[PDB]
Amino acid sequence: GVEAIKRGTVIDHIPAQIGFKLLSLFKLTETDQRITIGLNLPSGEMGRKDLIKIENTFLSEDQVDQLALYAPQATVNRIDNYEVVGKSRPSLPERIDNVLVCPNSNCISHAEPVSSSFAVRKRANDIALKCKYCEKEFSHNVVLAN
Amino acid sequence: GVEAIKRGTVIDHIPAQIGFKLLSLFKLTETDQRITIGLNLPSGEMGRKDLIKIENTFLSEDQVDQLALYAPQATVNRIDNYEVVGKSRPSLPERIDNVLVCPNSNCISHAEPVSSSFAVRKRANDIALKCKYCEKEFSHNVVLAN
Amino acid sequence: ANPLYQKHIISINDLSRDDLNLVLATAAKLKANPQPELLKHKVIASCFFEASTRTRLSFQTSMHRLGASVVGFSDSANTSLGKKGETLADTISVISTYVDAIVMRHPQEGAARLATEFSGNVPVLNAGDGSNQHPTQTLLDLFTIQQTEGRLDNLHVAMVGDLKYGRTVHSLTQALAKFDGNRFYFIAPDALAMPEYILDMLDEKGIAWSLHSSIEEVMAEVDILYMTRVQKERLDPSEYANVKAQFVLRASDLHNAKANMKVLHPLPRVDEIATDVDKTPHAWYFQQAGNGIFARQALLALVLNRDLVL
Amino acid sequence: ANPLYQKHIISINDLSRDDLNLVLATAAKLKANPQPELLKHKVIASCFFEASTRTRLSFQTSMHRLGASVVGFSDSANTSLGKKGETLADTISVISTYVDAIVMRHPQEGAARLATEFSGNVPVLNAGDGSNQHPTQTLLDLFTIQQTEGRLDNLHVAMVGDLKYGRTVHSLTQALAKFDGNRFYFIAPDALAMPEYILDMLDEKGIAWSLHSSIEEVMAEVDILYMTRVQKERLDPSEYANVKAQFVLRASDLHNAKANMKVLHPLPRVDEIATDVDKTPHAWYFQQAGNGIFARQALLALVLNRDLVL
Amino acid sequence: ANPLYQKHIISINDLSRDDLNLVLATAAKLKANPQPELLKHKVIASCFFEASTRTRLSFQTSMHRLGASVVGFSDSANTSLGKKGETLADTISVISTYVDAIVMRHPQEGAARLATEFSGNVPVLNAGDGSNQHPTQTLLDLFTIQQTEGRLDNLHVAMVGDLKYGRTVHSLTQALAKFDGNRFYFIAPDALAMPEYILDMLDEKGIAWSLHSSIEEVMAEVDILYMTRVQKERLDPSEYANVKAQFVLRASDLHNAKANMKVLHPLPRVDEIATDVDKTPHAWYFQQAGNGIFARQALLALVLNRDLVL
Ligand SMILES: Nc1ncnc2c1ncn2[C@@H]1O[C@H](COP(=O)(O)OP(=O)(O)OP(=O)(O)O)[C@@H](O)[C@H]1O
């Protein structure tokens, strides 16, 4: 293939510059197996894409839901014994828990031992995320302000 | 396995794990050039290594040296049109400016718009770093923070 | 079993038209026939980490009138949270092993929903959380509106004030949007405007609302005029241009009002309603405050009694 | 021009035995033969952003005693840095276009080096940057040590007190490590022990140092006994166990002291040197203080004069 | 005697194009040929009842650079006005019997005019009276503008920032309105817009001014871009929305700037001029700051000398 793994995931079609944030977000560096990261590769329709290839490793649920909110274009390909057993494009979940931080400075989530949680309303314009606690709804742009 | 490049820099033989740390510490991923990182590659020379190829980018002698602080055994191979034109190896830089922050809480560097600089000194196990401004020496482990 | 037995009364969004109506019918009943020992042998906590005259005192009197005992605090200053640095999560865990219901007021938005993750089986009733929700207030306002208009449907409601940080109007609009054909007119400083998430919800239900620069332009159309206070304690320093009330109701403005129109206010009131309005047939904010006893007696009755027969 | 002309004097670690010796000889010249017009038409800024009596006033009297004019401040509060929030770097940048030399005292370590970048061509003389360096102090202590013991080489020196934040002992241990065969005795509490980097430097030069738990241990051996103050202002809350000086020195102790031994203190003195010591032949610290006039005007004269003073 | 001898310098509105031109020529003379004894035997008071770095220190260095002696205070706290409650008028009345000229900075608008009544024959030089005037600033800005653009007439000048409390822009707009065909672009937030009376005066003289919402709008046209600081200390609580400078200037903006354009700032600078501008050919504000030495000693020399300096 353009590289090759017996078992593993290849996350293709990642937007330019998101690739590295993803590596960091999903703590994919804490591993011992082969990883190939192709930063800023061609992708005809949108020119630059990033490509991560983790050998003999698959993404847990949460990461695939996060992936939906960070890189919707991306396609997770389940490879087993070089066969692309599956190719799946993420869809937005109902709720995102414990990685998002609430824009509301006076939220209770900040000061107390609780996992944050956000409800995902897919607005026609963008993703509206509603905090579990303070009940404010925010633009996903605001919420993902890195 | 990894990729064939036209012209640029391949930092080879990076101790496994450190390869990502280098890409974050020095802004190597902040570019539009194509990069191919291979984390956890069989080396033999060492069990596992990491490798980084940057197409159409070159490093300067100080830049290469700066790498010695994490990867003294790395060979920064210079490539001009598929030819190995140079093989550089990192010496201790006598000073590192801009990338590191002083652990001295009451150092002036924190409150004013100046770039950091630490004098490097090989002491007797690891590397000792003298802050230019507050003049305290700290272990290089410590300066890499927590 | 009644549908509100053991529930947490946190946000208006979690209660239906039916639960609201059940509290009001009960409320009217307790008003007609007092129940002095309906909560005999129950101890309830009144946990106020933020200032209150009405919500705290009305609740504590409702508890007494139904025969419960009360324990609590008027300020966190003296608790091991305020002095020894205990988390609110631990504060609720232990208080839940002592009492039957916890009523709490708190400065940060979401503290009541937080409390429920820790209270175990004990019901938490939200007395106000920062600028978010105030469900018990809404219930005594719905009782007052019912009481005076004889309907909770097809009214003309105007909300005047700091609509941004007013937990009272955030709960009240959500509750009235559960009734048929209610029209809304919002008069606020733009920097203290109604939150877009309530607005979206109203558009989503196909309710009609409008923005207005004055009270006189809507006066002759409204059934209820709902005045609010500028929440100084919640204002960001950028908003200090907005501390003194922009729209002040003076008795002379009511000249072209519907005879039935009622002037409501959560209270405290600062400069926004001139005391001369107090002498008119339209002023109803103290009646409303009084009505808090029946609404809160009704709520408590329902949460702690599996079946009420009254 | 003489070796130090237009030079910044920020740390002892950048001066040579040669430089140090030159400043002291100009000092002995100047002490012997005053030059009142030596800096006639020069304006120096005295910028103290931290407290002082000695350093700032001896410096300003030295400038006047050479004919120069002094402008400046002793408090940060009323500067535009104090009230209007400007950066130190911009402070130094405008001040550089007014005066010929800047004497600066500042509470963060590295402030005077930060100022050299922005002073353009104007020399910066460090009057103390936090707990780091105090090179001016070191020059008057070396003038006094030479003036009493005859020499600066092969001396026995005990430094007692807060060696961790003692800007004075940090620079003086670096200056005496540039002379032959000087012996060091460091008596400090653990928490406030001599900084490691100083010790490494001592080891590299093969300078013998030894830690001691008592003044009586070193008393019979020492030529110079250099006492310091616990830098109260700089202590972390953890270090508040030791704020009172563990080592206090009373006249009684001098029973087995060498008749040449001098007791030096940078001053202020708080509890550590008991007033009864002030009448012994050994007490020299007030003398040391006055020797600041000479060492200071010798430094100023070299830095602003091309021609070596006679 | 020369036109300004013994004159008070309180506001730009009382000076003529003639006076302004005279001060600048004395400045260029003095810059070229220093007169160190020009004020030998004069004592000036430097009375600053408000914070400063530039004004007070450049003024005191100018007095020293002409041979004069400076007495005064930089803080009100330790005067008998500060602690004992005396009136400013009595302060000025006793100070008048000691010095030959008074430089005064004060937080109320009109303080320096108040002082002229009580100074008897002693000239008062205004160093800034609240948000009103700062005539000294205006004289060094005009020296710098002439020094860079060659002329003071037919210039394009944009003043950006807090024009409402900018004592600096109030006086400088009055000074440039005394020269021919100067064009004004005022970029401020509404709340901190240019005072009306300035605008009336501009209209009377047929001076063209225009308000703009952006630096990019004026960039290609402007000769002098004069940036100001939001006078934080002077803002009413209502105005606290705008404390951060709406207009911040980064190096990027200079892409379509005329190769003669100079960026001037009275300083302190806080967020509004981004450090990257400090390396462009356009950045001149530190130069402007230093030009204060010359403009200041030219003013002092005219006011205390009968004979025009050469
Ligand atoms: N033009 C090129 N394009 C891509 N990779 C190249 C190119 N030239 C060299 N490399 C890479 O850089 C490294 C250079 O290998 P080299 O030319 O030194 O032969 P070698 O046997 O690997 O010697 P060594 O073991 O010391 O590296 C290899 O990892 C190779 O992938």
Ligand SMILES: [Zn+2]
């Ligand atoms: Zn929240």
Ligand SMILES: [Zn+2]
């Ligand atoms: Zn430092």
